[model samples]
Target chain A: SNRELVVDFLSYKLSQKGYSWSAVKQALREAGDEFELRYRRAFSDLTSQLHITPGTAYQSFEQVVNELFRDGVNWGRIVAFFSFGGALCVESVDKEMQVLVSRIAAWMATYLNDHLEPWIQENGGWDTFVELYGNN
Target chain B: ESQEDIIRNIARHLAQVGDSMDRSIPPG
Candidate 1:
């Protein structure tokens, strides 16, 4: 169940940032919200430089994110990774290949589990992140 | 959940992350 795995991965990853699902729920409660306006800049920036067509979408995403982490992994890099996925999701919708969104989620979940989780665990899990960014 | 739901969900998650950190420039 990709969806279930995403839920778990998303929940854990975000919780490490000191953002509980309940906090997101509270934000939803306080305000109303996509590919949202905030993602516009990232979507524009990414789509302008990257050649993400239907044919090359998945592999291109893989390549780009891999290169992003080629230097190292940090909370900043991880945030960039998630934001990169957000940009891809927006581009997918704009191109009318909405179906790709699900696949993007799958990609995100797989990368988080397979690639990022080990590093996260090695670095004291999300607790370390919570202490660093959450306190500041 | 639906594809759109997943999309929006991830977007929401990204928003939270983005707010916590500075904007990141993708590698060119």
Candidate 2:
């Protein structure tokens, strides 16, 4: 229930930002897309170290994501965080761990709500993000 | 309609987001 609440809250915040939902997703997507090569490298590096299985998938997601934010939180890291989740989904499918795909998404929602949402809110929310990354 | 659906929806899109990521292990 809390996890779902997190998604709801995120959706609410994004919508309340005075931008269309399409605009917001496009901004976030472009920010992520712009540096995809680098994030892909990060994906490679993180997955290389992890020995993921169905049983360990959740914990591994937690561990790597925690480490990702260990230093600080910024929009760049946020994109990477989402990219990391996406990359994990791809890797899961490759390994026939498709079930973890949903699990990873759920974990992402939790992490965003618990850890990243505060900083995002304080820093001017998605509007600032769109202004920063969307114009290109 | 349900939150689980939302979660799954986001997950499905994220998988698409990762489409650009290279799925190769580097040659060491």
Candidate 3:
């Protein structure tokens, strides 16, 4: 599930804190076997969705983002949706599928810096983030 | 926070957000 997927990634990120992006890439490549099946599954799910969708990238992304941000969905989940996009962007750039990811990445960055950051700041703060991962 | 802290922060952010974002879509 995404819960474990998130944890696996955070474990990688935390374990390699202070490292460069190139370093992280090496880790992702070298540690490919270390990734959980759950993370790999979602990784493919997202990467394929970006490249194998029926129409354009924006067309494909809009549909999923809509479902993600639909009513009853909380801010926490919205953030996760953005993270998956980031992961997809990273994974895509590493491969032959670089088209269409730029816009998706920009939008997520804008909303994350603008909307989600403010919302979380007003409601809870960084600890809210820590607790979310800690519990998982 | 340091750069690594911020980076890890985003990773945790993704972990939290990705954790919640999973399975958000409905049946096809």
Against the true structure, what is every candidate's RMSD? 10.8, 12.8, 13.0
CAPRI grade, predicted model 2: incorrect
By DockQ rank, best first, the candidates go 3, 1, 2
Order of quality (lDDT) = 2, 1, 3
Tens digits of per-residue lDDT for model 1 on A12-124? Answer: 43343444432322221111111133454444343434545777777766766666666567655565565566556666666667666667778887888889998878776
lDDT of each: 0.53, 0.57, 0.43
Clash number by candidate, in order = 0, 0, 2
Chain A agreement with the truth for model 2, given as TM-score = 0.75
lDDT tens readout by residue for model 3, A10-111:
334424433222232333222232223345554433344344332455544444554444443443465455445645555544554555354555655555
Candidates' chain B TM-scores in the order shown: 0.66, 0.57, 0.59
Name the top lDDT candidate.
Answer: 2
Q: Write down the TM-score of every candidate.
A: 0.56, 0.64, 0.44
Candidate 2 — which residues are off by over 4 angstroms? A1-22, A40-49, B1-28
What shift in Å separates residue B21 of candidate 1 from its native position after superposition? 4.7
User: Residue-wise lDDT of candidate 2 within A1-136, one digit each (tens)?
Assistant: 3355333333433343332212656665555556465444443333533556888778667766665566566666676676666556666766777677667768888788788888878877767766666654
